[model samples]
Target: SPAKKKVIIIGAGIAGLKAASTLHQNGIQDCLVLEARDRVGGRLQTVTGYQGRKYDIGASWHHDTLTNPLFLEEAQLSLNDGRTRFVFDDDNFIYIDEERGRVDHDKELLLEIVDNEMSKFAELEFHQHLGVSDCSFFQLVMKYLLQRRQFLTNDQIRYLPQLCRYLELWHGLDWKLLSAKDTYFGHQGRNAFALNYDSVVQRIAQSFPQNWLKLSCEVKSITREPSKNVTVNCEDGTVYNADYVIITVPQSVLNLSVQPEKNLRGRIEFQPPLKPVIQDAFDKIHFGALGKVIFEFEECCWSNESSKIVTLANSTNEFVEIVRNAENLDELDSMLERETSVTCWSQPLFFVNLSKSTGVASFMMLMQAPLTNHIESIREDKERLFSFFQPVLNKIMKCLDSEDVIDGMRANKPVLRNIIVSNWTRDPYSRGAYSACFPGDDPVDMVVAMSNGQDSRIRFAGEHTIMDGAGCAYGAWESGRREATRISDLLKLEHHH
Candidate 1:
């Protein structure tokens, strides 16, 4: 039986929630939002402790705010422009190499040099020339670094993974895995932390009338009927029927194996599966792994320098050797468990002290992810998680010159505190952080195939499905509005028929 509702949107992420709001704004108010998580704001999770200090676990930035329409909304609301204060934390680093051994890199200057060339190289030169022979962003970076931004020695080139992470992890661009042919940069303006992204998410979701959302409702299967309405099955056995379905699932969940026997755990299955092209997108455009290790402290520990620290290591060398020699960890972990003090060490890792920005006194590591989907994590094992980052934390403390906080990070542990580790790779709802561009894919074609529904009944919207802004919050937000417009237009066409 066709329900009276207008549409059903899966995944209460920015895209889905924004879609719900957009539809209402378009005068189509009878829509249902199905969110799998117990809470809305899908991956936009913010953790607050230490008397209400907030640290985002995922999706922190309002990237490219100049052109981001959502941010324009935010700027209009807050009546303040969105501009980041930190100058990319250039002085906060420990460059490790024979040429520039363990020192602060003039990264701003370096970025400037690259920026100058990037405009030239990226204009018509798009950096997409590398075909099958070499596709890693490292290759692209190597050419630029070796020629333009100071002569990069082989060891200096070693830091590329960390820099590669700057491009890869956050943007869901796993350089080493994908061919260089697929790309669409979202650099229209300056980057910014959302201050409190939750605020934006709340305003958008609250724009709807009361009871517009159904949380804990995980969509299991979608059976599209010949009547042009769709039936949505949930894990809890509740079924929803709507005139249209707009799916905003992460690429990972969308591509999940229905069988589960193949050791794959995709969340939902579609009956009379999507257009073959859409199905191929779920297969071809690869999803990637990204994890966040958040270490909160009692207060500001290292006030001497920027809390930003970047770590770089050759996988076969310093990383493995540092772990091998970390046998004195018991004594170190004892004081770390008890109070201040750490073994003297540092890595090619990045950490920025956010106390200057967040108002609270704490710093988290990783100013940068794509060592590829091969990124590491402990996934709920607290002690093991500590062990995993033991070397890196030791290195971080050497720079921070402070004791690791305990209670705060215990969920996952780091001062190597107590910790909170984000295992998005192992997380079922989000197998990876977001979508990664693949070698054999076309950006325009990929966006079109993924965004357009077979009958405008199964619309797709996510950071991965946008054309101009492939990997940004603005893109994700824009896609929701885009899908709502799509579904709204399709509904009107049906009426005209």
Candidate 2:
């Protein structure tokens, strides 16, 4: 007899794992979860580094703590056991620069003051203003500079753009490539850094039936038969027939379905092909590369003034001169073009001093798009990684009242014992970090199409499918539960009939 399952969930990500957990909790049965990788957690992987210290290589923080259901669940567990599950590591961010050092709370620059104004300006321009066409974040910044030039100082104009680029680390996109409307967002509450996300994954994975999981099973195709059944085929000649199926592949991996290529890893072929709505939604949204690199040290020698630090890209006095001299926005835009090589100082970088947060004597750095891909490509070369990041590393140390970092990967001389880099871009299962909006992109289009599903028998659930927690672990976890509950209710109705 063929293995007939009530539901076959593809990908063991938070969405799929949570879906199975909810199904089991609702007394559903005969569900199968197929994961391409050997491990359960997809993007939420926690890895061990020097001295067995753990770090979540994937999503580290439980964002929007006020309303995140997953965070609430974890909080409940912590309350019951009195164990440390998370840490509220929010603090005033320390902004660093290559030339000027600390510029966060300067009396004359008042960069943070103008930064708040910039956010409000963006809100007024896009929010509730009908017929306001979307543009690149870069263009939006230029518009702000042109309109607010009378109010901003020369130093504010030069450094404000570099400082505001901190948002790039959020969406993992460059200002020129990011959607202006999608740039500024509201954080409902402070973020609680998960001690290690794999714990969350294991807890959910163990909630479901163990036999329901099938690891190392790469699903190749899904066909909805005319007989009210869905057939799934794995690459290893395994077949599964299910009454309903939930597809939880990453948006980047799912995008492969729209392409002609069939041999790519994690690519799934649909018998009837993806609907035009689903296929076309890809054009409206794209993936972003938000990479991480953990710099492990022998000891915590630097100052832990704040957990968050942003090393701004190099700004120039000449640029300030241009901002002041430009006759109009168009002329300034035309004059801003320049050619240069990519370096650590070329773009802004975010650093998390684990000493302040987790007491781990390390710095977790976040980088965006083009740099994420380039750095990930050479992750294996630890020496090159050290060299590439040495400038910013030294700058951070000097500002913290410490000596230069010593490469010990082969220390309180902040000795660099190890350098751990994220492989999301290089990983076939995770082509990039998560879903992001580009200029002119309407993320709602993709969200609507994914939430609606391909048909009654086939459903979709992932970070990109939901709006509330979009591109967040809690969002993906909630999306999984959303689809499973729908199926559970439908099955219950069928049984009653």
Candidate 3:
């Protein structure tokens, strides 16, 4: 009789958790999951809002249902419960141009333009030329829009920039740096709609992290021996060993500085080393940075019909004034004292104002740029970076007219509350929110992140691992399940041996 096999899973993210579940379900109960974070979902985090409303601060959307196991799980849950749906009313989309006051909804025309632009963008042969000449997603989309002259009215043109901004935000990359190939690749398959956090919350409730998951468990080093055993050393002065190990850490964490005694050359030391092609691919890949700014107002001053939740093209300081002016109140007695709304800004500078009408403010702001350029620079000068961003946001509020923006403004009671500014670039856990392929980079670098070695004893799985579903929750889930199957197969073979 053979002894039962034991497997070690690192990082209790979607990939690690799914792998653990799969292995356990397949009768591999000896498997243990080590997560650095106190939670299991990794990037899939659900933040509770005022009055118990749930919002997804991390990986919310499950783009592409057909290929994504997470989406399939969501669908199954939806089917059995019949309580949730992903579809949203297109007519409900509001385009508010603070400059233009209000804009009309043109669902048919917008959809048509999006489809055409996406199709033309897909046909581009940039990868074939190997980075010789590549255009950004915005450049490509704008060029296509102009060449085809698809936009019918000035209103449409006015709304186009905001629409593109939304897409770029959703992708978590600047349109200027995003590759046409990557964009098309993301859209080619049957993508699923964004997850309604309200609905998916119940399904993932049981998986939430408790006291078992600890924080500050920084992995100092990983070593794979000739005997096929792998060892992990944590910064907390703990060492772990196992027959099999699955690394789900982000690339940024691997790129950090480590002590020489650990013998881990940061990103350079890979046991057996990655293939040359994979190495080159990783070198070419680019990660971007983003910041979030949320403001809570005393009352709902902004109309829901405003199509634009955020204004990004305002390179000047005008938009900031608008935000500030929206908050001013004339009478001291009429001052707003309650938290009402929130807004989010995304890469390249975009914003999402949420719950303006409901009087509970929340928003996230994002700024995207090269990881090497933005993240590294910020780590060196975080205070300077914040100084620059704070004024920019203040200017936006002023441009928006703080009084009109908020019904009742208070001085000490910053209508803006719970302001969260996350520098994703600086975060060790998530080097970047989502992966983006640069002009010179190959998609295979992502493949290296997904690669498995040591006779499948060790596996790499995450959003960076899956090919078809990169940069979304679905990708992470699929990669996790795939690796779990591989481990299961290896265990079966080992039993025979």
Candidate 4:
């Protein structure tokens, strides 16, 4: 007979770790947490860069601080312990274009004012409308421009569209691929960058029984038996029979279960197959590749006026002419159909100057979608990466009152030491960064299905499962607690009977 336990959690991510924590807190004993990776903190990995400087290559922020329960708990712990666990790094954005240099907070343009109206315009367009067909974020911006052309200046029309693409970095999708309805969202509160997310992971991991966590156990299959027990099999031939199981794998990895291959690394085979609702929900949501590239420099030579900066993709007066001249949406669409090579300036890139926030001389830059995949594909080529981003890098320096960057990877003027890129897209364990919505995707469907679970014994918890914190680490943590509480209540009832 195999080892029997009350509950078995697969994947030692935040959700799985938190599930075990909640279970232990509720006095639920004999639970086991099996992790495929040798170490914990799945997508919340914090890696070391040049000069031993640490950076969160994975999730870095505690979003929605005012309402996030997990953050409140962390805040309480920090206050008691007298240690700094996080920092609020939100600051005024420094928007720079290749030609215009610095366009943020311009008196003539007043981009911020118009940006607010654009947000309101989007709200009015979809807030009350029933059966309004969803479109790409790009298309929605075009429609907004067409309707409000009389109010916008030529410079505004040219740069506003590019400025709006900042949302692309948020969803890890291009403006053309992003869902307009899912594009604009309230942060609910400011974001606090986790000083060391691994510390939070370690705290929760240590809260439960040390012996209950089993690392390097790749769960291959899960079966619900007539005996009212679920049997789980790992790749290493270890088997366990448990009363319940909580799966916290990334949505991208879980999608592999729907395919024909049974040998995929993170794909878990389900005997009798998953329910129709679970299978169908996969159609409504997608995974995004929101990747990071850390440019480690020897020193900070530029102005640290603001920690947040965005280098807009190259824009043109010709683009404004096209937007103004087109009579219909279709005409505007056709006129904007010219293709070109992608450069560093091809899309808006968000750079976080760690000098201002963490006193680290590095720029934590964010990239999205097709660019994310391509950049990560060639992440190994350091010189190539530097060459590609050199032009924009130099432009950013000039705008910030500094000279051009010096290649010092292989000193006085901002020497580039090393470049570290995220591997979320390539890593099989986390096929993509997190759950996202495409143009026609209804993310709610997936959330509803995952929250309900396949059965009473088989539950799901991840960044993709919850509504309030969807695609966030805190949401995954809360989802883990949710399933554990439910299971704990059920076990208590059974005990009385």
Give the lDDT of residue 281 in candidate 1: 58
Taken over the whole model, the C-alpha lDDT of each candidate is 0.61, 0.93, 0.52, 0.92
The TM-scores, one per candidate, come to 0.77, 0.98, 0.70, 0.98
lDDT of 3 by residue, 34-97 (tens): 6665555656666654445445556544565556566677677679989555532122333334
Each candidate structure's count of clashing pairs: 27, 1, 67, 0
Residue 231's lDDT within candidate 4 is 98
Expressed as tens digits, the lDDT of each residue in 281-321 for candidate 2 is 99999999999999998889989899999999998888878
Off by over 4 Å in 3: 1-5, 48-54, 81-92, 96-98, 103-133, 138-165, 185-216, 255-277, 298-301, 306-367, 370-403, 406-415, 452-455, 494-497
Model 1, span 332-400: residue lDDT tens: 223222212221121233455677656555555542244312334434576665555565555455545
lDDT of 4 by residue, 17-130 (tens): 999999999998998999988899999999997989999999999999999998999999989989999999999999998888899999988888898999999999888789
lDDT of model 2, residue 96: 93
> Which residue runs of candidate 2 sit more than 4 Å off their true CA positions?
none
Q: What residue runs in model 1 are displaced by over 4 Å at the alpha carbon?
A: 1-3, 49-52, 80-101, 105-134, 141-166, 171-175, 181-186, 257-266, 314-348, 367-377, 394-417, 490-497
Cα displacement (Å) at residue 172, model 2: 0.6
Q: Which of 2 and 3 is ahead in lDDT?
A: 2
